[PDB]
Curated annotation (Swiss-Prot), chain C:
Species of origin: Acinetobacter baumannii (strain AB0057)
The protein, known as: Large ribosomal subunit protein bL21
Pfam families: Ribosomal_L21p
Lineage, opening ranks: Bacteria, Pseudomonadati, Pseudomonadota, Gammaproteobacteria, Moraxellales
GO biological process: translation
Cited HAMAP family: Ribosomal_bL21
Swiss-Prot record, chain D:
Pfam families named among the record's database cross-references: Ribosomal_L32p (PF01783)
GO cellular component: large ribosomal subunit
Species in which this protein is naturally found: Acinetobacter baumannii (strain AB0057)
Protein name: Large ribosomal subunit protein bL32
InterPro entries membership: Ribosomal_bL32, Ribosomal_bL32_bact, Ribosomal_zn-bd
SUPFAM superfamilies in alphabetical order: Zn-binding ribosomal proteins
Superkingdom of source: Bacteria
Swiss-Prot record, chain E:
Source organism: Acinetobacter baumannii (strain AB0057)
Organism lineage string: Bacteria, Pseudomonadati, Pseudomonadota, Gammaproteobacteria, Moraxellales
CDD domains per record: Ribosomal_L13 (cd00392)
Name of the protein in question: Large ribosomal subunit protein uL13
Gene3D superfamilies reported for this sequence: Ribosomal protein L13 (3.90.1180.10)
GO cellular component: cytosolic large ribosomal subunit
Length: 117, 109, 103, 54, 142
RNA sequence: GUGAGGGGAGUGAAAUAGAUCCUGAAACCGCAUGCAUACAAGCAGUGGGAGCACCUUCGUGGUGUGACUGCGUACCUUUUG
RNA sequence: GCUAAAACUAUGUGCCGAAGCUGCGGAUGUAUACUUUGUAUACGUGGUAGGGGAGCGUUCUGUAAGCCGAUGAAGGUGUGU
RNA sequence: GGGAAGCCUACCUCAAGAUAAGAUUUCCCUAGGACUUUAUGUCCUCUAAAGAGCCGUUCGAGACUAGGACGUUGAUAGGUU
């Protein structure tokens, strides 16, 4: 029962090379190089699925800081005021409002100042 | 419509013939023939043979006018190689590759 | 007019007629869902910020269906340590269409 | 001395970017109406209104 | 994609003019860098230049505290052997005042193509006159 | 060039079955089209993300490309490492 | 870059900050009950040398004088799922 | 206030890829149609300037280049006197 490896080996190599599409030079042509590139891409993606949440929260915080400073507060004081006022709107929605609706963000800042008073 | 001529097994490197191919790519047939007739390259003779064959094909099998023709497509491909042994000093031997090429010329109006 | 609702441990700012995907819900396709815990309602100049929640506000949505997001590959590899493992993932979602907002 | 790494096809082509051939200076001869290399006798022996071979 | 990025075609760069007379160098430079990068706008985006144009006038009147006027050193290296050149704040502010602000703000801006693009929006002038009256800058007190 | 080689014609179900001729993979080498690229420093990807071209069920859509940006020093073996 | 500090000492309000904790969705192992189950609750699921458990594909024999196939098998090359 | 063969100038050469790409003098190009993507828009027709280069005779310039002179309205090279 002699077994020839050609068909299955070719399928596996072709699948790896297909996942390596778009890479530079030997990384999209040569199996030994392409296989390392795919694994490292997977490792990077696993790490960056965690990094993405941090980066987007940092962006929301920066935009909220800009809005609060336009309304006469700092970010930390505005967050403290909202907590004391019991408002539980999260930073993603707060930054969306800060970017797209200035009047509503002004109202939120006024509520935060009123609670801080 | 394009009319094709292929010269296969020309005894010259594809890298060397591609310079003449790029020299005449896209030009009108009369200008290309002048360039080939006054070039001093070896590949010019082979490229001229292929181009004249393509012009004759377009004239005889397709009844196209000569004055409207240009070199619409041209490229050179690697052919079969010949392998030889060159004896070096101190009993060492090297392998020599004698390269050939395929020339494809298409003319159109 | 737009409102702020909470679904699936997250929050969304929605308008009437908007289609959005949230975490998987147990409601049947074609059913109607009502959010009674609206956090904020804005009607241009009428701005209501709920202390926790705007009293009396309602958001009404219709369940379009259920589905799965695109496949994600998980890859783990410790170099020089002879260790490797892989797995796939597709997250479930429920699709909603906002049909009503009442402050 | 020899390379430590094989040169990529991109770098090889970048080196070859200066290898293109050029055109000769060809002009039409007034005496015969034929194309000839400028400042050279034609292949039939004519130059500047003179004939070389009878 | 409910969090949106600012689009470069919709960015508006406003022009401001700032007087440097009597200001502390670093405490002015921080605000200049902040407004050049655009941290003061609710549309701030890390990969987009959303900042403003800052004209600086009376650049040679900027101040440092302590003994920094004589002791703060500015170095540079020509890449020839032994080619380290050195000056100080007193000589540099009298000779080439624009270089002081350029260094101070360059050190506080990001170090990349976007940072190079950002720092082009700062115009520094020694005297009390600037050539940008056509852009109608507003007075900014910082 | 009475060469090699090819274009027609003809045969054949098939000639990209045309002679080292069934199928014709990969390394490697051309031509064509689309986008990017000549002020910017590094394992070349990854998470974001503008613009452009084609397609379109006109979009909260598909395909190709990827300015700008956070992070990021291959694999195996042997080792305390 | 910083000098009534962006340094040091003491005190107080806030905030940022991890794959830790919480929220929402999903998978899996063990135990306890449902006195069949495949349903609930509780507690677990970083790993080298190693030990244990469960599977995917390849060639050949029977099932097979069966079933699919020139209205197109195997193989090759794309696309979708 | 004074104060060194030391520092910055001063002397010589290079220097706007100084992408912040600078300044001055002088010279050149001023035409008609169609259409929709109403725009430094796409096809036609007509125009080809000031200059630059190819080529040639060459050099006290030179690896190849680059640089300098000249091309009949001419002494650029050879010859001749
Ligand atoms: C120990 N005493 C010193 C020693 O051995 N000296 C000789 C150097 C040997 C060298 N190290 C290895 C080498 O060059 N092998 C080549 C190789 O196998 C092959 O060429 C390629 N390219 O693959 C072949 C071509 O047919 O030629 C061989 N070489 C040959 N050398 C030969 C020669 O001179 N005469 C007779 C026959 O032996 C010839 N073949
Ligand atoms: Mg011998």
């Amino acid at each position: 029962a002699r077994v020839k490896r050609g068909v299955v080996a070719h399928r596996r190599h072709k699948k790896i090379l297909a996942r390596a599409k778009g890479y530079y030079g030997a990384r999209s042509r040569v199996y030994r190089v392409a296989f390392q590139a795919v694994i490292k891409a997977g490792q990077y993606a696993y790490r960056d699925r965690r990094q993405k949440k941090r980066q987007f929260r940092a962006l929301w915080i920066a935009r909220i800081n800009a809005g609060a400073r336009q309304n006469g507060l700092s970010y930390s004081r505005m967050i403290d005021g909202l907590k004391k006022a019991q408002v539980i709107i999260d930073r993603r929605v707060l930054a969306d409002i800060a970017m797209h609706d200035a009047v509503a963000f002004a109202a939120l800042a006024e509520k935060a100042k009123g609670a801080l008073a | 419509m394009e009319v094709t001529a292929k010269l296969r097994g020309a005894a010259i490197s594809a890298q060397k013939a591609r310079l003449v191919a790029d020299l005449i790519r896209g030009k009108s047939v009369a200008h290309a023939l002048n360039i080939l007739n006054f070039s001093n390259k070896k590949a010019a003779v082979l490229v001229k043979k292929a181009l004249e064959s393509a012009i004759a094909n377009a004239e005889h099998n397709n009844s196209l006018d000569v004055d409207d023709l240009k070199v619409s497509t041209i490229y050179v491909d690697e052919g079969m190689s010949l392998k030889r042994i060159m004896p070096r000093a101190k009993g060492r031997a090297d392998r020599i590759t004698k390269r050939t090429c395929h020339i494809t010329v298409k003319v159109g109006v | 007019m737009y409102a702020v609702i909470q679904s699936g441990g997250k929050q969304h700012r929605v308008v009437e007629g908007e289609t959005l995907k949230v975490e998987l819900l147990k409601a049947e396709s074609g059913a109607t869902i009502t959010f009674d815990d609206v956090l904020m309602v804005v009607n241009g100049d009428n701005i209501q910020i709920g202390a926790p929640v705007v009293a009396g506000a309602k958001v009404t949505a219709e369940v379009i269906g259920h589905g799965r997001h695109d496949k994600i590959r998980i890859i783990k590899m410790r170099r020089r340590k002879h260790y490797r493992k892989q797995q796939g993932h597709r997250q479930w979602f429920t699709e909603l269409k906002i049909t009503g907002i009442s402050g | 001395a020899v390379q430590q790494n094989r040169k990529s096809r991109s770098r090889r082509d970048m080196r070859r970017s200066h290898d293109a051939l050029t055109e000769n200076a060809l002009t039409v001869d007034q005496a015969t109406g034929e194309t000839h290399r400028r400042h050279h006798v034609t292949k039939d022996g004519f130059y500047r209104g003179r004939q070389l071979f009878a | 994609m409910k969090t949106l990025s600012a689009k470069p075609a919709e960015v508006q760069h406003d022009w401001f003019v700032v007087d440097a007379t009597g200001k502390t160098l670093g405490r002015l430079a921080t605000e200049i860098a902040r407004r050049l990068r655009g941290k003061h706008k609710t549309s701030y985006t890390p990969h987009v230049d959303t900042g403003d144009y800052i004209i600086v006038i009376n650049a040679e009147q900027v101040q440092v505290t302590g003994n920094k006027a004589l002791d703060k050193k500015y170095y540079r290296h020509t890449e020839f052997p032994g080619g380290l050149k050195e000056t100080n704040f007193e000589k540099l502010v009298a000779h080439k005042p624009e270089e002081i602000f350029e260094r101070a703000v360059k050190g506080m801006l990001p170090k990349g193509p976007l940072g190079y693009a950002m720092i082009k929006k700062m115009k520094v002038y020694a005297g009390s006159e600037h050539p940008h009256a056509a852009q109608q800058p507003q007075v900014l007190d910082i």
